[PDB]
């Protein structure tokens, strides 16, 4: 899921965890180079309608390869009446980037999602075309990876409800936009229940 | 993919088998008439068997290859020839039509597109594992000086310029009758060109003014496909005018 | 290859509404040795009887139950030669899916992919339509799967189905004894009953093979275990 | 509106102008250089800029006009011939191509004159030039520019422009080539010697 | 490249756009008696600006595509569809010897929603918006285009807004220019608005 | 002679019988499939007899019904075998002209198509003229029906036009089939009346069996 | 190969329609009824599932109805082996068009692309056509709501209410009277759909397993494709029997 | 029978009947004499026209200016072999930069002729070529047939009525070899006139000569210098 | 069964034998070469004059100094001539001389027969052409007319006619034409034979005339000049 460059006018993903919900927060940023004109266009996409995968950088191949991957995820989702596992999709994405051989164009995938029908928490980032990345901790990713990583450690509420994570996250996104050109350009925060997706769109330039 | 042994081979009969089967298959068909105007160049087919449970969309015999070029195909036969067969000749010409249109700065020369059409149906006859289509097409368009044309091909690819030509129901039968119909004072306005197309189609149509499908095309504006309800209004006017004549 | 080759189809329809060669192929699967496949809904068991009739087979390897990969297994019906390509094919597919997913090929997905290649073989020339019926088992994504793949290309998902010798009797017993969402013990027991329905392939332990798919993967069972299940049926 | 290829159309008829000279700096090897290629009377073309790239695209174009004409029997559109050649030019880059040709031929609406580049420009104007020296040529022509200029004013306008050009940017030499397309079928006026033009202006 | 201007401000249904007349190759304006605002259909316009030469190349490629899709639909184009398809086609063609590296402007009349204007970069990033600018001019124009409407435009204020910008482009930015085409397209007919 | 081919059902059989009365030629009818039979060597002998008898009778027409049959089928149910089919096929050719060159014996051949007919049999210059019937139109159909209406029970409940219109450009046979099925249908009811209701029911069965319009409507 | 094993599998007939295609229609007839009916706010497919036996794991959503895309669906009537090759490709083309274009896939577009592959087999290759006629239900932003049929040859016709399977001829005839081209809401449309399955299927009591109705409706500004539940299908059947008793006496 | 129904199906004759049909195509074709010296190789061919109001045209087709062919059979089929031959001469010039060895050149043709003979029912090329070539070994006049087998002949005559031409080659078998180039063309026209009856005799219009050799390129004389050679009759008494 | 790719018991190819008879169904080509130009006359092959003669093509320019008139199976001919136009032009393009009538003729003759349902692919034939061509043009040596037939035989011609009766078309030629004769008689000598070989009438919409002459390209006759020549019988 290789995208041309990184210049997409914003590149940032943060994922942060609870035991009652898990959240993936994203720039909703679009429009390559410094000049934007828009602040809307899909980037995080529901693929089982309750798991997300985020593909990050320039708009065209980000949307294009996601959709072409969606079709292979779908095949597997379609046939059986139960939908695919997160761990098997996690290597699937790793391989998809790898197919684009040596001296490849850099994407940065972030997968956030609770596992389907074996219930445990999952957060992962891919980048380059790299070794397997299953973690159960926290993951922040992009080219300003260090800046995201800080925030992904920052939100975990192990015992508060879903709501407190959102309000904490709104401040977390904002402070990050003042620190880098990767956050911002409108922010979409996704709190993911297992049975559906809740999309909230945050106020913030 | 293609068949290792040839479908079309030179055998003794004078032509070829598949040409021979192919002339039969547009003879036994229904009427498709094309009249050449001085406004719009208009094509129409006798049959689609419309009855109000279905709607035409791409179901039309008349399909526009280009912004000013369109062709109406009569694959149509004893038991009905194949929309499947026509569509291939259509796909290949349409890409070529648009490439020429790009190149000429005025409306695309019909001439190129018809010559082209003729070679497409012939190349299958020489190609291994293939056979020619059993269609006859009315290639219509306007030139790069704006000269309206109505051309015809048969199944093996042979082409002529015509004032008006009609195919199917015995091709020779109907086309000699379209000369009689045709007037040059009856092509002077847009409704009069359309009335000449329709009069040949009425002859033996089952449940007319619904089955009758004809589309109009403008100078470089896209094809306007007319619905049969709208076409019916003209059909009534002529069908009474025709009764009056006898 | 070094020739012209074929490309013409060996099947032409009928004004009946049938394809002629697949109906001859269906007769060959029935002429096989009994192979049953049941998805219990607590694991998948595929059991077969193999006509060796001399037990001069030193197989600690290839059998009529052969694992495709570590949580897919395959059992056939009919003739052996057609099996040989399908078993190799399946292993290759298992490998293709292993590279990207790295969880070996899922059953719903496998069938579609085999089905497409089987259909070509009918549709094209220089190849011919099989006359083997495969029963595919898998446990992946915390669900057991049982499918049957016909020699045409068709795939149906079954709870319990039979093939091989005296399948008509088998499918009818299967409806009566087995009902949907019964236990792993019932699935195994009826499975061995269908083989016993009519045997006649030398009654020794190494003449029946079972391979079971469950939560921990797929392994084929030792012939001695298989015999114990049989012993119950009179 | 640049180099030794220029064409502008007027109200009496049309003028075509070219040099026949080659070799910037002391280096030279071609003294009867045919920048206005025209083996036939039906289509005419011009060069400009890079020596190799003009010659190559125009010999490919040479074949291309002849083929259209053959296929229709009568001569086709000036636009179609030129545009089929333009698709090839854009794709042609990666050979150090940098072709800047002016396509002239007879179209059905009338005379058609179109501007060709190696990056695929196609626009119809009354006047086009390819290269870098007609940047100098636009000051004396523009000043006096009418589009109803006499046949006689135009011949004198071209003759003088080369003589004045020689003085201003050196490069002219051997022969001055003049061609006139009159009606719709072209003729080459004269291959008038350099030494004559110097005195006249 | 790094020449040539576009600006579009969309109204209640109107859209006003202007671009300069001037195709300069080398150092001098080769063509100027042609416009390079193209009718790809009679409901759709592409106005391409960047490379003077590169505009025709992109226009033609889209022209076949737009029609092939029209065939597919067998009814007029959809705005959403036109931005994404032209974007995909153009990012792939940028690498190609037949390149694109133009900031293009889609104007279309949509069968359902209504007026649509679609933003395209040189890098080639698709966005529908209602306040956007094109060419070398896009860096210059876009903040201003952000400010002066509330949601979308009103034509009177726009007219004043447009004349003010056109003195600026000649002033600060460097074109060969001496005439500008100003147009409003309501979605079915082309209107000429006046040049400053 | 003549060769009668095209769309089957035009009324190919009626035509031989009708023309035969006008000329007043002795009408011999023999099926082409009847000539191949179990018996060994009886097959060509029979064909000789068929011609010999036609000749003796004097003006004659031999209507050979369903001759298409020898060609289409390699029967595999005759003990005479493939041998039988071969030897029969030659003898008819011999008896026709051959070196025999019998005169006054016209053969009118009824076939489905003469593209399904055996290539030995078919050849020009034994039969000078071949007639290909067009698809019967709405117009031809009315005249045939007025005759059948005259032969049928008379009422105002006979509605001819409606049935003809509904149908497509299709055979003469159908006009006959609509009338015969309508009388039969009446008997089921316990009615000796043939009304518009029997006809409307008859239109459906006749139309399906013969060619059926709902496949064709898509392709048109 | 050999030329004595060739009488030309692929050839043109003088009647214009291939032998193998008419032969394939009889096979379509044999498989169970699959219909599509239009609503003025949706489109739905109603089909009888190939399975009718007790034994079925129910790994597919329905063997006949394939959920291809988030705006397109198709059902198959005919040869199931043949169905698997067309439905998998179909799944990929319909999906690419909604996904990328952001413009919902037209049935008319879809069919022309698939029919090219079907057709190639009938004209050349020595091959044979597909055994299925497929009914596409979808919504596109162009025409609006649509229904398309494709046939073995690669011939299409666009209806708005059509039935295929056994007693097709009877069915379409019933459908002409009650539905023309748009008059039924989503609930009446669904009632009409159950009615057609009723006459044509032998069992007139039906079941949620026996039939499957999947609906496609755009609700709350996104186009929703859903397989209805066994409860929902059963509620529609229970509502339909009461009404069946009253309608025909 | 049923063993010539294809050329894959073998005959219980030891040679397929279809190979032998192809040999009749060449016999039905034009009388041609091919002789060589020890510097030059000469092809004498008989022209034919397909109409009365037509001037006869060469049955010598150029492979090239160093190897050349004379057709006996179909003109089209000879040309089809020719094109391949032309390519080889075009490659010979690239690789070796000499006239391609004639024996080598003939085996590559033979390989091509071999191929339809292998295929199902496909046609073996029904031309025989008399190939005149000049290499470093000397001149070669080869006989190529409708099979893949080539003969290296001293002099051979193939085509119609060629036995009368063949007794001439036998009589002056040693003579061709020692002679000067003008004489080599002279014995060929004397031999070629022998095929024809006493009545029918060679004239400048129907005579085509192809001369290749050490000293000169392949040149076709159709009326270029046919005349001094044509001079002196000596026909077979029939 | 066996092919049409097999030899007959005559020792000749089956498919080539059939092709010549196929020619006879259609159009005629009459080319008369005089030393003042090469003229081509061909029939439009009409059903009515109400068939526009605006752009019926059957005499087409191969090069602008060589024209070609076609006879035989008209459909098969349309692709052979289109193809012939590119190959002659590749030659014109490289050599930059005025093409010779004999070079165009040889080149198209190998394409006639490549037939076979083995050792051929879609771009190659699976049937022989049954198109006989008459290429007529003026070169450096002067006016030449060449006849090409499906068996690839190329021959020099001063008058060659092939048509609906190939035999018929020729027998009339002997009778009318004589070796040294004017251009104006050459055009006329074609109109008298043209009728003989056709079974159809003399109409201006039914004949097509083209002359290629020294210093002068391929010319297509208009309705007025088509009439001047019809007058000359």
UniProtKB/Swiss-Prot annotation, chain B:
Do you know which Gene3D superfamilies this protein is assigned to? Glutamine Phosphoribosylpyrophosphate, subunit 1, domain 1
Location of the protein in the cell: Cytoplasm; Nucleus
Q: Does the keyword Cytoplasm apply?
A: yes
Q: Which GO terms describe its biological process?
A: proteasome-mediated ubiquitin-dependent protein catabolic process
Q: Do you know which SUPFAM superfamilies this protein is assigned to?
A: N-terminal nucleophile aminohydrolases (Ntn hydrolases) (SSF56235)
What positions does the record give for glycosylation? 136
Q: Which domain of life is it from?
A: Eukaryota
Q: SMART domains recorded for this chain?
A: Proteasome_A_N
Indicate where the modification N6-acetyllysine is found in the sequence. Answer: 233
Query: Which sequence positions carry the modification called Phosphotyrosine?
Result: 159
Tissue-specific expression: Ubiquitous.
What InterPro entries does this protein's entry cite? Ntn_hydrolases_N (IPR029055), Proteasome_alpha (IPR050115), Proteasome_alpha-type (IPR023332), Proteasome_asu_N (IPR000426), Proteasome_sua/b (IPR001353)
Q: Name one Pfam family in it.
A: Proteasome_A_N
Assigned keywords, A-Z? Acetylation, Cytoplasm, Glycoprotein, Nucleus, Phosphoprotein, Proteasome
Q: Which GO terms describe its cellular component?
A: cytoplasm; nucleus; proteasome complex; proteasome core complex; proteasome core complex, alpha-subunit complex
GO terms of molecular function? identical protein binding
Q: Which PANTHER family match?
A: PROTEASOME SUBUNIT ALPHA/BETA
Q: Can you tell me which family this protein belongs to?
A: Belongs to the peptidase T1A family.
What is this protein for, i.e. what is its function?
Answer: Component of the 20S core proteasome complex involved in the proteolytic degradation of most intracellular proteins. This complex plays numerous essential roles within the cell by associating with different regulatory particles. Associated with two 19S regulatory particles, forms the 26S proteasome and thus participates in the ATP-dependent degradation of ubiquitinated proteins.
Name this protein carries in UniProt? Proteasome subunit alpha type-7
Swiss-Prot record, chain F:
Name one cellular component (GO) term. Answer: proteasome complex
Q: For this UniProt entry, which segments traverse the membrane? A: none
Q: Which residues carry this modification: Phosphotyrosine?
A: 219
The answer to whether the entry has keyword DNA repair is no
Bilayer topology: Lipid-anchor
Q: Where in the cell is it found?
A: Cytoplasm; Nucleus; Membrane
Q: Which residues carry this modification: Phosphothreonine?
A: 214
Residues that hold ATP according to the record: 6-13
UniProtKB keywords? Acetylation, ATP-binding, Cytoplasm, Isopeptide bond, Lipoprotein, Membrane, Myristate, Nucleotide-binding, Nucleus, Phosphoprotein, Proteasome, Ubl conjugation
- State the function annotated in the UniProt record: Component of the 26S proteasome, a multiprotein complex involved in the ATP-dependent degradation of ubiquitinated proteins. This complex plays a key role in the maintenance of protein homeostasis by removing misfolded or damaged proteins, which could impair cellular functions, and by removing proteins whose functions are no longer required. Therefore, the proteasome participates in numerous cellular processes, including cell cycle progression, apoptosis, or DNA damage repair.
Q: Which family does it belong to?
A: Belongs to the AAA ATPase family.
* Assembly with partners or alone: Component of the 19S proteasome regulatory particle complex. The 26S proteasome consists of a 20S core particle (CP) and two 19S regulatory subunits (RP). The regulatory particle is made of a lid composed of 9 subunits, a base containing 6 ATPases including PSMC1 and few additional components. Interacts with SCA7. Interacts with NGLY1. Interacts with PAAF1.
Query: What is this protein's record name?
Result: 26S proteasome regulatory subunit 4
Curated annotation (Swiss-Prot), chain G:
Where in or outside the cell it occurs: the entry states: Cytoplasm; Nucleus
Q: Which CDD domains does this entry report, sorted A to Z?
A: proteasome_alpha_type_4
N6-acetyllysine: modified positions: 127, 176
Give GO cellular component annotations, separated by semicolons.
Answer: cytoplasm; cytosol; nucleoplasm; nucleus; P-body; proteasome complex; proteasome core complex; proteasome core complex, alpha-subunit complex
**Pfam family of the protein (one):** Proteasome
* GO term, biological process aspect, one: proteasome-mediated ubiquitin-dependent protein catabolic process
Q: Which PROSITE patterns match?
A: PROTEASOME_ALPHA_1, PROTEASOME_ALPHA_2
Query: Which residues are annotated as modified residue Phosphoserine in the UniProt record?
Result: 13, 75, 173
Tissue-level expression reads: Ubiquitous.
- Keyword terms: Acetylation, Cytoplasm, Nucleus, Phosphoprotein, Proteasome
Under SUPFAM superfamilies, the record lists:
N-terminal nucleophile aminohydrolases (Ntn hydrolases)
Give the family this protein belongs to, as stated in its UniProt record. Belongs to the peptidase T1A family.
PANTHER family associated with the record:
PROTEASOME SUBUNIT ALPHA/BETA
Job of this protein = Component of the 20S core proteasome complex involved in the proteolytic degradation of most intracellular proteins. This complex plays numerous essential roles within the cell by associating with different regulatory particles. Associated with two 19S regulatory particles, forms the 26S proteasome and thus participates in the ATP-dependent degradation of ubiquitinated proteins.
Q: What is the name of this protein?
A: Proteasome subunit alpha type-4
Organism of this sequence:
Rattus norvegicus (Rat)
From Swiss-Prot, chain I:
Subcellular locations according to the entry: Cytoplasm; Nucleus
Family matches, as Pfam families: Proteasome, Proteasome_A_N
The protein's role, per its UniProt record: Component of the 20S core proteasome complex involved in the proteolytic degradation of most intracellular proteins. This complex plays numerous essential roles within the cell by associating with different regulatory particles. Associated with two 19S regulatory particles, forms the 26S proteasome and thus participates in the ATP-dependent degradation of ubiquitinated proteins.
BP-aspect Gene Ontology terms: proteasome-mediated ubiquitin-dependent protein catabolic process
Q: Which GO CC terms are listed, alphabetically?
A: cytoplasm; nucleus; proteasome complex; proteasome core complex; proteasome core complex, alpha-subunit complex
In-chain residues carrying the UniProt-annotated modification Phosphoserine: 8, 48, 55
Q: Identify residues that carry Phosphothreonine.
A: 47
Q: PANTHER family attached here?
A: PROTEASOME SUBUNIT ALPHA/BETA
Glycosylated residues, chain numbering = 190
- UniProt record similarity statement: Belongs to the peptidase T1A family.
| Keywords from the UniProt entry | Acetylation, Cytoplasm, Glycoprotein, Nucleus, Phosphoprotein, Proteasome
Which PROSITE patterns does its entry note? PROTEASOME_ALPHA_1, PROTEASOME_ALPHA_2
Major subcellular location class: cytoplasm
Instruction: Specify the protein name.
Output: Proteasome subunit alpha type-5
């Amino acid at each position: 899921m290789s995208v041309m460059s990184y210049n997409g006018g914003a590149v940032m993903a943060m994922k942060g965890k609870n035991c009652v919900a898990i959240a993936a927060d994203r720039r909703f940023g679009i429009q390559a180079q410094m000049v934007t004109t828009d602040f809307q266009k899909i980037f995080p996409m529901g693929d089982r309608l309750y798991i997300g995968l985020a593909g990050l950088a320039t708009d065209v191949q980000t949307v294009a390869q996601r959709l072409k991957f969606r079709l292979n995820l779908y095949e597997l989702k379609e046939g059986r009446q139960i939908k695919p596992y997160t761990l098997m999709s996690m290597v699937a994405n790793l391989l998809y980037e790898k197919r684009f051989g040596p001296y490849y164009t850099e994407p940065v995938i972030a997968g956030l999602d609770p596992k389907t029908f074996k219930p445990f928490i999952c957060s992962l980032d891919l980048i380059g075309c790299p070794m397997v990345t299953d973690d159960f901790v926290v993951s922040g990713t992009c080219s300003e990876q260090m800046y995201g990583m800080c925030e992904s450690l920052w939100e975990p509420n192990m015992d508060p409800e879903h709501l407190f994570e959102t309000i904490s996250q709104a401040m977390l996104n904002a402070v990050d936009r003042d620190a880098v050109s990767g956050m911002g350009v409108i922010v979409h925060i996704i709190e993911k229940d297992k049975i559906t997706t809740r999309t909230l769109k945050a106020r913030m330039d | 993919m293609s068949y290792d042994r040839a479908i079309t081979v030179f055998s003794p009969d004078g032509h070829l088998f598949q040409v021979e089967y192919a002339q039969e298959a547009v003879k036994k068909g229904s009427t498709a008439v094309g009249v050449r105007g001085r406004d719009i160049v208009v094509l129409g087919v006798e049959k689609k068997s419309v009855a109000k449970l279905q709607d035409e969309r791409t179901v039309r015999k008349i399909c526009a290859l280009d912004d000013n070029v369109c062709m109406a195909f009569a694959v149509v036969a004893s038991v009905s020839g194949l929309t499947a067969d026509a569509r291939i000749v259509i796909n290949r010409a349409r890409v070529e039509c648009q490439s020429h249109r790009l190149t000429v700065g005025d409306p695309v020369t019909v001439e190129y597109i018809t010559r082209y059409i003729a070679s497409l149906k012939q190349r299958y006859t020489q190609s291994n594992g293939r056979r020619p289509f059993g269609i006859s097409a009315l290639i219509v368009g306007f030139d790069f000086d704006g000269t309206p044309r109505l051309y015809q091909t048969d199944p093996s690819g042979t082409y002529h310029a015509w004032k008006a030509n009609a195919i199917g129901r015995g091709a020779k039968s109907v086309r000699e009758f379209l000369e009689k119909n045709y007037t040059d004072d009856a092509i002077e306005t847009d409704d009069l060109t359309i009335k000449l197309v329709i009069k040949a189609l009425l002859e033996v149509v089952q449940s007319g003014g619904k089955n009758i499908e004809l589309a109009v095309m403008r100078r470089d504006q896209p094809l306007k496909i007319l619905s049969p309800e709208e076409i019916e209004k003209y059909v009534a006017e002529i069908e009474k005018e025709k009764e009056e004549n006898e | 290859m070094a020739e012209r080759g074929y490309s013409f189809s060996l099947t032409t329809f009928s004004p009946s509404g049938k394809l002629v060669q697949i109906e001859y192929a269906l007769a060959a699967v029935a002429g096989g040795a009994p192979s049953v496949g049941i998805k219990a809904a607590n694991g998948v068991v595929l059991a077969t009887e193999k006509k060796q009739k001399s037990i001069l087979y030193d197989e600690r390897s290839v059998h009529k139950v052969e694992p495709i990969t570590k949580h897919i297994g395959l059992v056939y019906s009919g003739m052996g030669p057609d099996y040989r390509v399908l078993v190799h094919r399946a292993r290759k597919l298992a490998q293709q899916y292993y590279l990207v997913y790295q969880e070996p090929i899922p059953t719903a997905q496998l069938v579609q992919r085999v089905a497409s290649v089987m259909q070509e073989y009918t549709q094209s020339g220089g190849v011919r339509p099989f006359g083997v019926s495969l029963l595919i088992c898998g446990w992946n994504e915390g669900r057991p799967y049982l499918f049957q793949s016909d020699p045409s290309g068709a795939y149906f998902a079954w709870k319990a189905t039979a093939m091989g010798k005296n399948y008509v009797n088998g499918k009818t017993f299967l409806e009566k004894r087995y009902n949907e969402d019964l236990e792993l013990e019932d699935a195994i027991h009826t499975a061995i009953l269908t083989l016993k329905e009519s045997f006649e392939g030398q009654m020794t332990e190494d003449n029946i093979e079972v391979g079971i798919c469950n939560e921990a993967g797929f392994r084929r069972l030792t012939p001695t275990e298989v015999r114990d299940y049989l012993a119950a049926i009179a | 509106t640049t180099t030794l290829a220029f064409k502008f159309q007027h109200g009496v008829i049309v003028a075509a102008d070219s040099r026949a000279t080659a070799g910037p700096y002391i280096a030279s090897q071609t003294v009867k250089k045919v920048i206005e290629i025209n083996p036939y009377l039906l289509g005419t073309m011009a060069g400009g800029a890079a020596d190799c790239s003009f010659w190559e695209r125009l010999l490919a174009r040479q074949c291309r006009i002849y083929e259209l004409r053959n296929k229709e029997r009568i001569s086709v559109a000036a636009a179609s011939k030129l545009l089929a050649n333009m698709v090839y030019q854009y794709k042609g880059m990666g050979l150090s191509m940098g072709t800047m040709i002016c396509g002239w031929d007879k179209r059905g609406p009338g005379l058609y004159y179109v501007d060709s580049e190696g990056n695929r420009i196609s626009g119809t104007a009354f006047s086009v030039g390819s290269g870098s020296v007609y940047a100098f040529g636009v000051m004396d022509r523009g000043y006096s520019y009418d589009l109803q200029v006499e046949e006689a004013y135009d011949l004198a306008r071209r003759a003088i422009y080369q003589a004045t050009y020689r003085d201003a940017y050196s490069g002219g030499a051997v022969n001055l080539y003049h061609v006139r397309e009159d009606g719709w079928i072209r003729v080459s006026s004269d291959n008038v010697a350099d030494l004559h033009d110097k005195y006249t202006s | 490249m790094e020449y040539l201007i576009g600006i579009q401000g969309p109204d209640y249904v109107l859209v006003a756009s202007d671009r300069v007349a001037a195709s300069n190759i080398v150092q001098m304006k080769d063509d100027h008696d042609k416009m390079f605002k193209m009718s790809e259909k009679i409901l759709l316009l592409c106005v391409g600006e960047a490379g003077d030469t590169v505009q025709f190349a992109e226009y033609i490629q889209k022209n076949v595509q737009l029609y092939k899709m029209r065939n597919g639909y067998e009814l007029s184009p959809t705005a959403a569809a036109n931005f994404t398809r032209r974007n995909l086609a153009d990012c792939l063609r940028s690498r190609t010897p037949y390149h694109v590296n133009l900031l293009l402007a889609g104007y279309d009349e949509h069968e359902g929603p209504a007026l649509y204007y679609m933003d395209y970069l040189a890098a080639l990033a698709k966005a529908p918006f209602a306040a956007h600018g094109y060419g070398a001019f896009l860096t210059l124009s876009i903040l201003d285009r952000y400010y002066t409407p509330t949601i979308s435009r009103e034509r009177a204020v726009e007219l004043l807004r447009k004349c003010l910008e056109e003195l600026q482009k000649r002033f600060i930015l460097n074109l060969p220019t001496f005439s500008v085409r100003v147009i409003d397209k309501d979605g079915i007919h082309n209107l000429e608005n006046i040049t400053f | 002679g003549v060769i009668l081919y095209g769309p089957p059902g035009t009324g190919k059989t009626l035509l031989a019988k009708a023309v035969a009365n006008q000329t007043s030629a002795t009408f011999l009818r023999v099926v082409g499939s009847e000539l191949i039979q179990k018996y060994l060597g009886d097959g060509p002998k029979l064909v000789r007899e068929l011609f010999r008898v036609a000749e003796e009778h004097a003006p004659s027409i031999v209507f050979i019904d369903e001759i298409d049959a020898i060609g289409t089928k390699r029967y595999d149910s005759n003990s005479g075998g493939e041998r039988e089919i071969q030897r029969t096929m030659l003898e008819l050719l011999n008896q026709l002209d051959g070196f025999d060159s019998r005169g006054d014996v016209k053969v009118i051949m009824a076939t489905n198509r003469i593209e399904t007919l055996d290539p030995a049999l078919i050849r020009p210059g034994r039969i000078d003229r071949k007639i290909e019937f067009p698809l019967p139109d709405e117009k031809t159909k009315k005249r045939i029906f007025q005759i059948h209406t005259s032969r049928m029970t008379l009422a105002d409940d006979v509605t001819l036009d409606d049935l003809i219109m509904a149908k497509d450009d299709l055979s003469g046979a159908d006009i006959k089939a609509i009338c015969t099925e309508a009388g039969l249908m009446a008997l089921r009811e316990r009615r000796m009346k043939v009304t518009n209701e029997d006809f409307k029911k008859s239109k459906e069965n006749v139309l399906y069996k013969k060619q059926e319009g709902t496949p064709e409507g898509l392709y048109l | 190969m050999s030329r004595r094993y060739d009488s030309r599998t692929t050839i043109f007939s003088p009647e214009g329609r291939l032998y193998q295609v008419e032969y394939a229609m009889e096979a379509i007839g044999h498989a169970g009824t699959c219909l599509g009916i239009l609503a003025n706010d949706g489109v739905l497919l109603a089909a009888e599932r190939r399975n009718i036996h007790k034994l079925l794991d129910e790994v597919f959503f329905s063997e006949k109805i394939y959920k291809l895309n988030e705006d397109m669906a198709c059902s198959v009537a005919g040869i199931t082996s043949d169905a698997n090759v067309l439905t998998n490709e179909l799944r990929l083309i319909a999906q690419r068009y909604l996904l990328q274009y952001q413009e919902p896939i037209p049935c008319e577009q879809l069919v022309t692309a698939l029919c090219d592959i079907k057709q190639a087999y009938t004209q050349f290759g020595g091959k044979r056509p597909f055994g299925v006629s497929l009914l596409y239900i979808g919504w596109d932003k162009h025409y609006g709501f649509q229904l398309y049929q494709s046939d073995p040859s690669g011939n299409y016709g666009g209806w708005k209410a059509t039935c295929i399977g056994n007693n097709s001829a009877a069915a379409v005839s019933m459908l002409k009277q009650d539905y023309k081209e748009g008059e039924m809401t989503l609930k009446s449309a669904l009632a009409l759909a159950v009615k057609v399955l009723n006459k044509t299927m032998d069992v007139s009591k039906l079941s949620a397993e026996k039939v499957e109705i999947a609906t496609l409706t755009r609700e709350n500004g996104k186009t929703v494709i859903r397989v209805l539940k066994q409860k929902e299908v059963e509620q529609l059947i229970k509502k339909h029997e009461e009404e069946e008793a009253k309608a025909e006496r | 029978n049923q063993y010539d129904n294809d050329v894959t199906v073998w005959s219980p004759q030891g040679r397929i009947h279809q190979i032998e049909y192809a040999m009749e195509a060449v016999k039905q074709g034009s009388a041609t004499v091919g002789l060589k010296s020890k510097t030059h190789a000469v092809l004498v061919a008989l022209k034919r026209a397909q109409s009365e109001l037509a001037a006869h045209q060469k049955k010598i087709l150029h492979v090239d200016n160093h190897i050349g062919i004379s057709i006996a059979g179909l003109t089209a089929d000879a040309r089809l072999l020719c094109n391949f031959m032309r390519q080889e001469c075009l490659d010979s010039r690239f690789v070796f930069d000499r006239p391609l060895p004639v024996s080598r050149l003939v085996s590559l043709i033979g390989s091509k002729t071999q191929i339809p003979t292998q295929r199902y029912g496909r046609r073996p090329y029904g031309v025989g070529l008399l190939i005149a070539g000049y290499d470093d070994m000397g001149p070669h006049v080869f006989q190529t047939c409708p099979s893949a087998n080539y003969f290296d002949c001293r002099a051979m005559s193939i085509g119609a009525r060629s036995q009368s031409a063949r007794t001439y080659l036998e009589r002056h078998m040693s003579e061709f070899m020692q002679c000067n180039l003008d004489e080599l063309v002279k014995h060929g026209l004397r031999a070629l006139r022998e095929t024809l009856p006493a009545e029918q005799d060679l004239t400048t219009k129907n005579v085509s000569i192809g001369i290749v050799g050490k000293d000169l390129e392949f040149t076709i004389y159709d009326d270029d210098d046919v005349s001094p050679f044509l001079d002196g009759l000596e026909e077979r008494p029939q | 069964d066996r092919g049409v790719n097999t030899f007959s018991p005559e020792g000749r190819l089956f498919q080539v034998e059939y092709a010549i008879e196929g020619h006879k169904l259609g159009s005629t080509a009459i080319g008369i070469q005089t030393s003042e130009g090469v003229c081509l006359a061909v029939e439009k092959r009409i059903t009515s004059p109400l068939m526009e003669p605006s752009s019926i093509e059957k005499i087409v320019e191969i090069d602008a100094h060589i024209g070609c008139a076609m006879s035989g199976l008209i459909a098969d001919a349309k692709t052979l001539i289109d193809k012939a136009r590119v190959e002659t032009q590749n030659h014109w393009f490289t050599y930059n001389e005025t093409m010779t009538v004999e070079s165009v003729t040889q080149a198209v003759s190998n394409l006639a027969l490549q037939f076979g349902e083995e050792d051929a692919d879609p771009g190659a034939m699976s049937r022989p052409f049954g198109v006989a061509l008459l290429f007529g043009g003026v070169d450096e040596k002067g006016p030449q007319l060449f006849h090409m037939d499906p068996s690839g035989t190329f021959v020099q011609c001063d008058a060659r006619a092939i048509g609906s009766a190939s035999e018929g078309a020729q027998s009339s030629l002997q009778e009318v034409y004589h070796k040294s004769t004017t251009l104006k008689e050459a055009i006329k000598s074609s109109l008298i034979i043209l009728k003989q070989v056709m079974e159809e009438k003399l109409n201006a919409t039914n004949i097509e005339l083209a002359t290629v002459q020294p210093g002068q390209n391929f010319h297509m006759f208009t309705k007025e000049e088509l009439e001047e020549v019809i007058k000359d019988i």
